C-alpha cells in the first residue's frame, strides 16, 4: 500500500528535522 | 499521489547528502 | 515506480540509521 510508504516517509522527514537540530547544536557547542 | 512521495523522496535524498556531508566535516574537526 | 519508492525509502532508512549513529559518536568524542 501507499499509505505504507506514506507513514515511512513522515517519520523519515521527522527523524531529518531532529538530526538536522543535533547537527547545529554540535557545530556551537564546538563539535566543529 | 504518487507523484506527491516521489517528491517528498527526492526532497529526503537531497538533505540526506547534506547531513552526511555536515557530519563528515563535524567529524574531521573532531579528530 | 512504486518498487522504485520503496527502494529509496529503504535506502533513506538505511542512510538516516548511520547519520543517527555517527552523531551518537559524535557526542562521545566532543565530551
Do not use: C, T
Not at 516517509?9 to 547545529?24: D, P, R, T, W
Request: hydrophobic share 35%; proline share 0%; aromatic share 4%.
Amino acid at each position: 500500500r501507499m499509505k505504507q510508504l506514506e507513514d515511512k516517509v513522515e517519520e523519515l522527514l521527522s527523524k531529518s528535522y531532529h538530526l538536522e537540530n543535533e547537527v547545529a547544536r554540535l557545530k556551537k557547542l564546538v563539535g566543529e
